[PDB]
Amino acid sequence: ELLPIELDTLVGKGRFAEVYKAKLKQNTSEQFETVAVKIFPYEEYASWKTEKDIFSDINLKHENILQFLTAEERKTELGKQYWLITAFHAKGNLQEYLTRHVISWEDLRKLGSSLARGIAHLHSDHTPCGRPKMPIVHRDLKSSNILVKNDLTCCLCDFGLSLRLDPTLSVDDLANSGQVGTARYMAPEVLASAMNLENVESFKQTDVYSMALVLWEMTSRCNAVGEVKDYEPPFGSKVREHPCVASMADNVLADAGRPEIPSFWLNHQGIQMVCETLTECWDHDPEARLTAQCVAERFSELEH
Template sequence: MGSWRRPGLLALLLLSLSCGASARRSLKTNLCKWCDSTAPACEEKVCYSNCNLNSYCEDPYEICVAIWRQDNESIRISTLCHNPHRPIENLMVPNYNTSRCIMSHQPSEDGVIYVCGCVDEQECNDKLIFENHTNGYSMLQSKEVIPVAAISLLPPLLVAVMITVIFYLCRTQKRRKRAKAWGGKQGQPPALPEPGKATEREEKLSVLMDEGSAGTSPAELLPIELDEMVGKGQFAEVWRAKLSHSRSGQYETVAVKIFPCEEYSSWKNESQIFTDTSLRHDSVLQFLTAEDRGTGPRREYWLITAYHSRGNLKDYLSRHVLSWMELQKMAGSLVSGVAHLHSDYTACGRPKIPIAHRDIKSTNVLVKNEQECVLCDFGIAIRLDPSLTADDFANSGQVGTARYMAPEVLESRVNLEDLESFKQMDVYSMALVLWEMASRCEVVGEVKNYELPFGSKVQEQPCVDTMRDIVLHGRGRPEIPSSWLVHQGMRFLCDTITECWDHDPEARLTAHCVAERFNLMAQMDCDDILNNNMDNEASKTASPGGEHQDSDGSRNIQ
């Protein structure tokens, strides 16, 4: 009886795996390269599209497609998502039920055309395979030109190899020195921090990797030990972890954001944002490196950053009441970070591409210390490159968290022709976070329990339709009680918040303008402190009853 059970069980297992694969296929769309026209890079029978853009297909039945067009002078590649049951440029896509994009020659009167289609592998239309013949690129090269070109390319190739070797040796030596310095001169193990308190090491994380590092290869993975999961979002988990620095057991506490393999595009977008050196700022989460770990279904994508033990702003506000000075400095650091993202220049005047965060909320702000915050989670952030067109931003409308969405986002009426629109959405969301901070400041009078914007009017995770009714149709905003306006500084802050969440995007303040207002508030407080000190000095030399103090210290009544 055992002899027939095994084949039956094996068949059942294969059937379940096949059904599982079909179910996953039906639920997920393909991630494809998507460029109108690029020049390929070729080696014998394999070419690469050289396309730097990708997109998930809108429908699960769409596949990744690449079209090769060649004339006597050039070769251009088009990559996209497409329904294989429909013709594309009067051509049908052949043999697309494979993860390899195998080029197939198509008859055409307009030069040479090859087409391929593929599924089930991310960006599978990037690698173009010519199985039965050499690629079209080699057809453009004559037999006489190829040897000459190879000989002419040999010297610069050797130079490039030498530079690469020297760079690798220098980098390895530098990392060894940094690791040794990090370990300390005495080699003593680090003292354990008190519960709930961050060590100085945690707050002053030094970046070991070279500036501008976009990631590490498997051979260079950092020695990291995951400790405890401290957060979980829609796309990834966040872990507290130990980064080892020496054999003596010394380590640094870091944060590791772990994306599963199906969230590759989110990891790639955030790592590309982080590796832009112009992003670096005191109010932006400090980035260490990005890593690709594991293989197959266990493959994971990591982002390694500084760790801040105080957690996110939402949790911090639920446990702490802020003084006016703490509110001013923490809110000011948040505003400064947003202004830096939106700016066309770095602090030292170097040009940069502005960035829109698109998901500013209190859980995406970390508390660095009692006077500073940092922005984090750039998973759906976009670079506002002026060279891009409205079509490039076509899928950039209604994203983010519904509670913090601006009216124009809820209405799906974002002006994609104007890049300032994305900044205006950020300013609206920032205003709601500023309101959260203001609601927990002691100068407002009776400080109520912490509430998210719109509080009990909506559920914990309201949908877009609910927020549309409140914000768009009802023109609702979080309440600013009259007791908040008694304090001069708080009144000034509330006026700023109101101007930032204006229904008209064009009427909102810019983040730079809000930052200037915070600088003005800080100056006003300095003047008040100075005036109070002068008043105190005057009260020491003269009392209301006519008493004055002589230079020798004696007091007389006049």
């Protein structure tokens, strides 16, 4: 049976689906509960299925991963819709949050350390207890799809382009997907079409590079650095609003371009640590990049 849900507001429109703030009126007498509904048309059934498989995976439950209530199929006059019902985070996406607010050092520490913890959890080949689990690579990490919870910690969602690192995966299966994701956040090796298709685990390195760009966005809006400029997306000054891969290749790969880090930012000890860490993470060489777990560990050291 379908949950008693009333759609309130359209909060997100993506290639695959629409996200709605909704009211779950389980009970007529008591106050309604705010939930999120991601709606996929029948044409996007595949994206719905990929996300559903992730959200319903018991091993994937984590504080930094969007909480999942249920998946439904709803017949409509036009056809059928595929729904994902989840917890709603009122603060919204990280990109919009950074645009509107200048964060404290404590905020940056919480946001950056929780982002790394969520990615590390997806990447992990084992559960906290010690049981083997099949790693997931997000493949489309960016500030626009990271939610901010009420306690100012990050929460991952938008798993439509995600890849389970299954051993049975073929080169043909992988190459066919090719460059998947947002061009602005693509790692240089992806822009170069230089990956080893047989090596599925190298996709973890691409996620780390995108994470580095997000960490830089958080850092750019932190008041600890000093004077804070208006929020700009990575490469905002260099490329157009919807950049192509050729143009991103030109900047990221040909010019080795990265978002600028003014030297005055380094004056703060904490900011310096974050900048050094993120710099290692966006290195041209994937091998030079730290793991998400390593980054989570460095953030732990930031209490000092």
